[PDB]
Every structure is written in C-alpha cells, then in structure tokens.
Amino acid sequence: TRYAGKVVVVTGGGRGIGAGIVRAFVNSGARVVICDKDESGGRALEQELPGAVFILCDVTQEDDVKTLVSETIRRFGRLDCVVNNAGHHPPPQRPEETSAQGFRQLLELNLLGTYTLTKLALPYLRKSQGNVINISSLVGAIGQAQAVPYVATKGAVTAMTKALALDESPYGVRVNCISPGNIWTPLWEELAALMPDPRASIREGMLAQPLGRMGQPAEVGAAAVFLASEANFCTGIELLVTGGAELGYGCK
Amino acid sequence: TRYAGKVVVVTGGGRGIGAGIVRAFVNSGARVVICDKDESGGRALEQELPGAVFILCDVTQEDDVKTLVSETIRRFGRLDCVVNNAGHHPPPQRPEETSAQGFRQLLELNLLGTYTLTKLALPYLRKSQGNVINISSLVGAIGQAQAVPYVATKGAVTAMTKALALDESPYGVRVNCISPGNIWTPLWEELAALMPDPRASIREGMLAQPLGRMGQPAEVGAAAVFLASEANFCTGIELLVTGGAELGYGCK
Amino acid sequence: TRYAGKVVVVTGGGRGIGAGIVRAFVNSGARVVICDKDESGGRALEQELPGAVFILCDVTQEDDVKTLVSETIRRFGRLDCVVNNAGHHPPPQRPEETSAQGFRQLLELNLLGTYTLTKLALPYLRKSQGNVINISSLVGAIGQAQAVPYVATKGAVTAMTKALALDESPYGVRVNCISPGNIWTPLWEELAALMPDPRASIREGMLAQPLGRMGQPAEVGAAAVFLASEANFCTGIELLVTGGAELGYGCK
Amino acid sequence: TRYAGKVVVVTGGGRGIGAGIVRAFVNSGARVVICDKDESGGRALEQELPGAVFILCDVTQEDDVKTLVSETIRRFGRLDCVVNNAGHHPPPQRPEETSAQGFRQLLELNLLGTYTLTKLALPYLRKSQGNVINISSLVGAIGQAQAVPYVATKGAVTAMTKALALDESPYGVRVNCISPGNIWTPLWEELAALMPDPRASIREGMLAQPLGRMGQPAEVGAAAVFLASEANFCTGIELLVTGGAELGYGCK
Ligand SMILES: NC(=O)c1ccc[n+]([C@@H]2O[C@H](COP(=O)([O-])OP(=O)(O)OC[C@H]3O[C@@H](n4cnc5c(N)ncnc54)[C@H](O)[C@@H]3O)[C@@H](O)[C@H]2O)c1
Ligand SMILES: NC(=O)c1ccc[n+]([C@@H]2O[C@H](COP(=O)([O-])OP(=O)(O)OC[C@H]3O[C@@H](n4cnc5c(N)ncnc54)[C@H](O)[C@@H]3O)[C@@H](O)[C@H]2O)c1
Ligand SMILES: NC(=O)c1ccc[n+]([C@@H]2O[C@H](COP(=O)([O-])OP(=O)(O)OC[C@H]3O[C@@H](n4cnc5c(N)ncnc54)[C@H](O)[C@@H]3O)[C@@H](O)[C@H]2O)c1
Ligand SMILES: NC(=O)c1ccc[n+]([C@@H]2O[C@H](COP(=O)([O-])OP(=O)(O)OC[C@H]3O[C@@H](n4cnc5c(N)ncnc54)[C@H](O)[C@@H]3O)[C@@H](O)[C@H]2O)c1
Ligand SMILES: O=[N+]([O-])c1ccc(F)c(O)c1
Ligand SMILES: O=[N+]([O-])c1ccc(F)c(O)c1
Ligand SMILES: O=[N+]([O-])c1ccc(F)c(O)c1
Ligand SMILES: O=[N+]([O-])c1ccc(F)c(O)c1
Ligand code: NA
Ligand code: NA
Ligand code: NA
Ligand code: NA
C-alpha cells in the first residue's frame, strides 16, 4: 500500500527493466498501465498481474501517445506517475559507422518519445500532484565506447529531467530520473549474443561493477517506487543504480 | 516490515534529522539504537517508540563508540545498518574568522566521528551483509558562503563514502550517503535565531529550493530506509534530498 | 606562437563567443577558418584578421559541412582543431509551449550540426593528432527554467563529448567541451530585449554569478586555446567558464 | 610573458608535480617561491631556474607558513598566486588497517596545510586580485580502493575550494583546484616499488586512462598557469587532468 489508489504508466513495460518497474508498482498497490509497442510481453504481464493492464503504444507515434493518455484517464480516472522507460541501445558502432539518420531515429525513441508522453501527461499530473520518472543511463554522465548516438540520447534525458523539474516545481510536479548501469535484461542479453564470445562479454559486464554482478530490473523498480511514493523533497535528481561502476580506477 | 528483524544505529538521533531517521526505521520494523551525546531528546524518543532504545555516546570519544557497538550487539545480537548523522554546522564565519583549531574540532565531529563508528561496526556489518549510510550535505558538492570548515568536512564525508564503498563491496557491505539541502531542524532554527532578521533568514532558506519549502527530517528518514532496505545495487552513491536547490540559476 | 602552424575551424565564428574564439586562436598564431551561416560578421572578421578567412557554411546542411572541410584542407593542407560553437538558444518557453518540431530543429543545430562536422573532420584530425572542442553550456549540467529543448541539446553535447573522447583516445584525438555560463553576446542581448524590462534582465544575469559580472567571449576563447594547445592529458572534460554560477545557494 | 611581473608560491615544489608547476610558471615569466620541507630538490631547482628561489617550509608548521609569506613579500613586494601542491599519498591500506591518528596526520598535510597558507596569503592576494590553486585529486570525486583517509583529504580540498571561491569572489580573488589522475612522479614511482610486481603496477596505472599513458607534471603545470593567467571568469572549478580515467566502464 505505499502507492495505493495511484495510477502509473510505464512505457517499454512488456519486458526487461520496464517489466520490473511494472511489477514493483503493482506490488506497491498502484494500478499500472503497461505501454509497449510489442504485444507479446505486455499482454502476458496483464494476464499475470491484477491491477496491471496493457495498452499497445509506440512512443514515437504521437497519436499513439495521445490515445495512451486518454485511455488511462477514461479507464482509471487519474494519472499519478509516468515512467519513461521505452528506449533502445544499438549494437556497438564506431563513430565513423554512425549516421545522422540513425542518430535522429535514436533521438526519436530515447528522447522525443519521453518528451511527448511527459507533455501529454503533465496536465493530469498537475491535478494529482504526480511525478515523472525518466530511465536514463550511467553512460550519459560518464560516456561509453562505441555508442556516441546512444550516449548523446541519455545525456539529453538527464539534462531535460533537470530543466523540467525547474519548470514544474511551482506546480507541485516532481521530475526525476534513474541512471542504471549494467542491468541484466533481454537487451543486454541480445547485445551479448552479437559478441564473438558472448559469455566473455557477460563476464566482463559483471566485473565492470565493484559489487561484482549486474543489476536486476526489480532493483530499478524499487528505486522507481521510492521516487514516486517517498521522495517528495527530491526533484531533478539522477538516482544511480549502477553497483558502483562509476567509482574508482579501472581498465580503459 | 520492510526492514523487520534488522538492528540500526543512528547517531545524533535525539532530535532533528536523526530523530526523523530513527522514526523512519522504527516504522519499517527495525529495532533502532539511538546514539546521542545529549540525554534530553533521545531518552524521550526511547520512551515514545517501542523498538527504539537510547544509549548515550559522544561520537568523538572512541571508547564511547566502542561501548556503543558492544552494547548494541550484546542487547540485540546483530547490527545491520549504521547511520552517521551526528554532526554540526557552526554559525556563519568569514574565512579570516576561522581557525585551524576550530577546523580540527569540526573535523573530529563531522568526519572522524563517522569514521570511527563505521570502523568499529564494519566487522558486524560484514557478518550481516549490512550497510553504512552517511549524512553529508549538498554544500559539500556545491559549496556555501561563510562555511569553509563545514563545507570541507562534508566534502570529505561524500568522498570517503565512495572510497569505503570500493573497499567493502567485495564483502557485500554497501556504503552510501545522503546529501540533504535545507532541512528544517533545531539546528536550522538555532542558526536563524542568530540572524538579524530570523524570519527573513528562514524565508530566504525556503526560497533557495525550487519546491519553495525546506525539507523535513521524515523525508531524509524515507531516503535512509530506502538505501538500507531496497537499494541493494546502490553503493557509493550520493542521494540528493534538496528540493532541487542545486538546479538552475539563482542570486549569488 | 602557442598554436603556430595549426589550422582551426570555428563554427558560428562571425559574432559572439565564436568571434572571441576566432580571435583567441589567431592571437595564438593559428590560421582560422571562420564558418558561419550569416555573411555579415564573418566577412568583416576575415578582412580584419590576417590568418582568419571566412567560409559560408550552415552546419545543418551536410553538403555545406562537406565543402567546409574540403575547402579547409585544399587551402591550408591540414586540420588541427574543430570548435563546434554554432548553436542557438530559443526565447523562454514554458514546457507546454514547446513542440516536438521545434525540439527537432534545435537538435539539428545544437547537436547534429556538431556531430556532422566532427565526423567529417576526424579523418584529418587523426592525421594531425588534432582535437575537438564543443561549446556546450552550464545549463546542460544543472538545468534552466523555460528551456527544456535547449537544455536537452546541451545535455547531449556534453555526454557525446565524453563518448567521442573514449572512441578517439586510441587514435590520439582529444575531445573536450567548454560549458560557459552567462556570456555577454549578441544572443544574450537579443534575449534581454524581449524581456519586459531588458535592463532588469541583464542586471539579474550579472548577479547570477558570484563574480558579479557576465563572462566575455575572449575568456571562452582563452579556455579554447588552452584545451587545444596545452591540455594534452585532458580528454572528455567539461571546462566550466561560468563565474561560479553553479556554486552555492541562490534564489530559485 | 603570460604571467610576467607576478609572484607565485608553490608548495611541495622541490620535485614531482610541484616541480612541474614551478617550471611552468617560471617559463611564463613569473617569479616563483619554491616551498618544500626537503632541501634537496628545491635548492637544486633554485640554482637551475633564474626567477625561482627556494624557502624551506613545512606546511604543517604554522610559523613556517607565516615566515614563508613574510619572506615572499619582503623579497618580492607582492603575491599573486598560491599553489597548494604539498601533499602525500600513503601506501595502500585496507579500512581496518587505518587509524584515527594516521587520518588526522594526513588531514594536517593534505587539507590543513593548504588551509593555513591560503589564510595567511589571502590578504596579499586581495591587494593583487590574485588567485588560489589547490592540487586535489580525481579520487576525491570518484573514490579509490585502499585509500579512505587520502580520498577523504582530497574530498575536503575540492569542496573547500568551492566554499572559498564563494567567500572571496566579492573581493576579486579566484579560487580553483586541479584534480590530476595518474601522474608519473617520484611518489607514484615510490608506491609502485612497494608492489610485489612494480612494473605490473605501473603498466596497470598507464592503462587506467583511455589515453594509455600517465600524465606529466608539466601538463599539470600548464593547467595551473592557465588557471592563474587566463581563466578570469573561472572560480570554484575543478580542472580534471586525468587522461580520461573517469570516463566509461572498466574493470573494478
Ligand atoms: N543495462 C541496461 O540494460 C540499461 C542500463 C541503463 C539504461 N537502460 C535503459 O533502460 C530502458 C529499458 O532497457 P532494457 O534493458 O529493459 O531493454 P529491453 O530491450 O529489454 O526492453 C525495452 C522495452 O521497450 C519497448 N520499446 C522499444 N521501443 C519502443 C517504442 N518505440 N514504443 C514503446 N515501447 C518501446 C520494447 O518493446 C521492450 O519491451 C531503456 O531506456 C534503456 O536505455 C538500460
Ligand atoms: N539543513 C540541514 O539541517 C542539514 C543539511 C545538510 C546536512 N545536514 C546534516 O544533518 C545532520 C543532522 O543535522 P540536524 O540539522 O539534524 O542538526 P541537529 O543539531 O538538530 O541535531 C544533531 C544531533 O546530533 C547530536 N550530536 C552532536 N554532536 C554529537 C556528538 N559528538 N556525538 C553524538 N551526537 C552528537 C546532537 O545532540 C543532536 O541531537 C548533520 O550531520 C548535519 O550536518 C543538515
Ligand atoms: N551565455 C551565453 O551566451 C552562452 C552560454 C552557454 C553556451 N553558449 C553557447 O555558445 C555558442 C555561441 O553562442 P553565442 O551567445 O555566441 O550566440 P550568437 O547568437 O551571438 O552567435 C552564434 C553564431 O552562430 C551562427 N550560427 C547559428 N546557426 C548556425 C548554423 N546553422 N550554421 C552556422 N552558423 C550558425 C550565427 O550566425 C552566429 O554568428 C552556442 O552554442 C551557445 O549555445 C552561450
Ligand atoms: N598521480 C599523482 O601523483 C597525483 C594524482 C592526484 C593528485 N596528486 C597530488 O599532487 C600533489 C603532489 O604529488 P606528487 O605526486 O608530486 O608527490 P611527490 O611526493 O613527488 O612530491 C610532493 C612534494 O611535497 C613535499 N612535501 C610533502 N610534505 C610537505 C610538507 N609538510 N610541507 C612542505 N612540503 C611538503 C615533498 O617534499 C615533495 O617535494 C599532492 O597533493 C598529491 O596528492 C598526485
Ligand atoms: O546493454 N545495454 O543496453 C546497456 C548497458 C549498459 C548501459 F549503461 C546502458 O545504458 C545500456
Ligand atoms: O542549517 N544548517 O545547518 C544547514 C543548512 C543547509 C545545509 F546544506 C547544511 O549542510 C546545513
Ligand atoms: O543567453 N543565452 O543564450 C544563454 C545564457 C546562459 C546559458 F547558460 C546559455 O547556454 C545560453
Ligand atoms: O600515486 N599517487 O600518489 C596517486 C595516484 C593517483 C591519484 F589519483 C592520486 O591522488 C595519487
Ligand atoms: Na491484469
Ligand atoms: Na522504546
Ligand atoms: Na584575413
Ligand atoms: Na634562481
């Protein structure tokens, strides 16, 4: 019951971190609208979780987002929290292998998709003194090799989170982000499978953290529920969920 | 029950932020040892809260700290979380008004007191896979006018928190800090009373945050319970509880 | 002679910060290619400065950028430093007043324009062990009111700078950025003129810094010459040229 | 001639980074007072460099510092820049191997020594609109394994630098710090010699940077001359001279 009576929209909620966030909020008593552009994960989740329902929505299609918000209000009567988790990490690409076209496409998903849902949802979040939680990345703050476009998209997300927190603070709407590090998800697993030695890549990924393992979507979920339900003097913050990857010297 | 069965030591727990942290952990099901060098607040708190008990301890006196830890283990049989909240902010002092003697005294309380309890407690925290939470300050990261020694003490706390998180991560002991901003406490109130216009000073303190108010000890308490009970992939982090004071342009 | 024999491209070099950067590099002995999409400032600068020449180039038009690089090499035979200063700050806009269309347009100038020149120039910078300097902003790191799209563009620039520094470090190409704060430029002056009380807005802008004044383009120029000529163990850094605006408490 | 006519005090200037800083400032036209508690390096440097002279001074002995400042003024008639470089890094020590006594001793050198010279010098720096440059460390911001006391001392230095920049900005005195990473110095070499495999330790130290080498004292010197002579809109900043060690993922 930490977030009972509340209504939460999670984008990219059908698998991975989003699915962990969906589960965290349901376990806290909220009703959750799972947004995802693929049917498979989200529809199963909705069958599994009383209190979660699934609405197909591609966050890069404005009308989809418009319909997502209006369906949430029509079905549930309020909107308290928006979690902008939908995003993608391309495979490793050297700078000269990137293109301005792929860059823009990544910006559409990772940055503009977050911007659009937030914009359409803020009128309802103002009425509920709700809050916005963006899922960014540690590599927006510290960089990453072979990921110029992706790093750039997360740099904008973290900064935009602080700018929005300024604009919306007079209206009681808090805006925060979570910067996860290595989190074991289908995306991390997909990228590993494209490496020459997948198990070497995964073992390297675990050791990149002092804690010696990768994170779990459930641990990002717990951070998200904290930001929504118990962090009322927190706005514009970047909550690091990284196992300490940013600390200390390493092999670069 | 988020931290049921756990044993927590909070220093400076008799009033202010510490008292908020004590209450947060009791409400989460932990048993709490209130450490404080003044009897008044802590003994009242212990009478008020089933599950909290009070042990007089001056964190700058090593033998007091030694006895604090041994009493906690003898009475409760385990130690899961140490909250190093005991600390002090001197009144405003221009650089030339400070002295190397007052600086050292402040370092004894704000930095070495935290170091000593952490050192004596870590053997028990290793057995319990417990965690350490230091209460630092936003002004360690961004500075503050007329507070060179105080800012320095909190700079060391935040950095030490990251160094300790590195050393202790192989042993499963997480080490994090909270950086509060303006939190309305007896200390904030005492400092205001020394200003020519106390109500002007307090009104200025509220507006230094975009949220337009100061924080409450209970909100630092919620952040502390989160770090202890739900943040298992978080180590070496600095959790900002500031109402957004670090964001954006202001009058300097 | 600190950068004698070197060839520098400065975008947005016809006025403002860019013009200060152009002048700084000419004074250091480099030859400078002034890139700008307006003729007026840059052509005057080229007449004024032996060693600086002007090439019309809109950094959002790829073929313009392609021609800019090929003209620089054809005329000067090498390329050592690229300064991505071309950028724009829209007038104040509340979040709900922004659009996804204006956002993309701003991303084209502030982020993709920087990306394109850097990409086309890196092959020549690799041959010369040259370096890249992006002009970002303090408000990418700390946010700003009524500037969600602009803040986002600078968030991506700072992050991209770190990602590129990683990719290019094995090839001896350093990549850094400068984050200016309030710098008195025609852009700052234009924005002030749209305020109800322009002189109030400017006076507020000066006081937002502890130093009590805004910065000068020449001071950003000095920082840029330092990064190019003397900072060979610096890569991926964010050099703050802000008069201390990010320090301490203020009125928010 | 970038700093001609100016008078600079460098502590710990007899070898290592300090010696690089001394040489940088002499090459810029300043007269330099080499402060060091060992005679050997500093006296040789003074014989070698016209414009540099050597004064024996232990920065932890207040009367030594008092005499250092009065000798500088008596001999040279002004004081423009103070570089607080004297400091020490203990050998690797696990947390439980440290003591509150060694911690205090380290604080005396790394933090209080910097504080004392700065205090005694500020009256003269105010008359000259001079500036203060503290040599801190990257590991104050990101931590380091087996160096709790050392990391803490540098955490306080960086924070104190920002607090002092606030207090002194109304008086025209800028206060900045440099955070070097791995710099090849006699201290780095001494620590390596205590490792089981010294050449393995050094090779590991080079690879901890994306640039693939350690830094040179001359590169810290160049950063210091920049902060003194050309960075007049910079105060309270932390100039990273690290070869990019803080960027990206590594082996932790
Ligand atoms: N280590 C990590 O995996 C890691 C670290 C830092 C940040 N992140 C971020 O966490 C978020 C989730 O990543 P993940 O690892 O869970 O990935 P994932 O690939 O496992 O899941 C992402 C989900 O988003 C959905 N999605 C993708 N594009 C969408 C669109 N246009 N509209 C709607 N839904 C869309 C996908 O269908 C999928 O269900 C992303 O923003 C990612 O950048 C991940
Ligand atoms: N705005 C704020 O008040 C604020 C902001 C940032 C950080 N902090 C930090 O929060 C912590 C608590 O501050 P507060 O505002 O609650 O202050 P407070 O003065 O209201 O309470 C501090 C408590 O610590 C106790 N204490 C002091 N010295 C001690 C010692 N040597 N041994 C044991 N106990 C000791 C006092 O008796 C008191 O009960 C401090 O570390 C402070 O620096 C406060
Ligand atoms: N306080 C400040 O003014 C401040 C602070 C932080 C960052 N910045 C950044 O500094 C840079 C310069 O800003 P300024 O204040 O000097 O502005 P400015 O408006 O005075 O000058 C910018 C110049 O860039 C040119 N330009 C614009 N769009 C271009 C394009 N598509 N192609 C080529 N040239 C183009 C303009 O013609 C102009 O000459 C920008 O990136 C800005 O965001 C400025
Ligand atoms: N990689 C690095 O070596 C590195 C990285 C970051 C920061 N730093 C900092 O750079 C500074 C210089 O380090 P270094 O590597 O050049 O070390 P170093 O040991 O080679 O030289 C330090 C000098 O300071 C002098 N000194 C020591 N204690 C003193 C005292 N009490 N009074 C006066 N002089 C004293 C010594 O005699 C010596 O000449 C230190 O503050 C250190 O923490 C070094
Ligand atoms: O596998 N990924 O998609 C991934 C790994 C680490 C990150 F920090 C990140 O943003 C994304
Ligand atoms: O009132 N104080 O003691 C106080 C106020 C603000 C801070 F950030 C702080 O560390 C302490
Ligand atoms: O006036 N400007 O365009 C302006 C002012 C301050 C900033 F930090 C900035 O990026 C832009
Ligand atoms: O060898 N050292 O003393 C050393 C190495 C790296 C650091 F960042 C440092 O502060 C000190
Ligand atoms: Na359901
Ligand atoms: Na009790
Ligand atoms: Na010319
Ligand atoms: Na000499």
PDB file of C-alpha atoms and ligand atoms in Angstrom, chain A residues 45-54, ligand 9:
ATOM      1  CA  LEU A  45       2.054  -9.380 -17.920  1.00  0.00           C
ATOM      2  CA  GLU A  46      -1.519  -8.053 -17.891  1.00  0.00           C
ATOM      3  CA  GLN A  47      -2.919 -11.571 -17.651  1.00  0.00           C
ATOM      4  CA  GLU A  48      -0.467 -12.272 -14.825  1.00  0.00           C
ATOM      5  CA  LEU A  49      -0.928  -9.132 -12.679  1.00  0.00           C
ATOM      6  CA  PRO A  50      -4.248  -7.975 -11.242  1.00  0.00           C
ATOM      7  CA  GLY A  51      -4.021  -4.204 -11.349  1.00  0.00           C
ATOM      8  CA  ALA A  52      -1.841  -4.063 -14.483  1.00  0.00           C
ATOM      9  CA  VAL A  53      -3.409  -3.670 -17.934  1.00  0.00           C
ATOM     10  CA  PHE A  54      -1.731  -3.440 -21.327  1.00  0.00           C
TER      11      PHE A  54
HETATM   12 NA    NA E   9      -4.426  -7.601 -15.057  1.00  0.00          NA
END
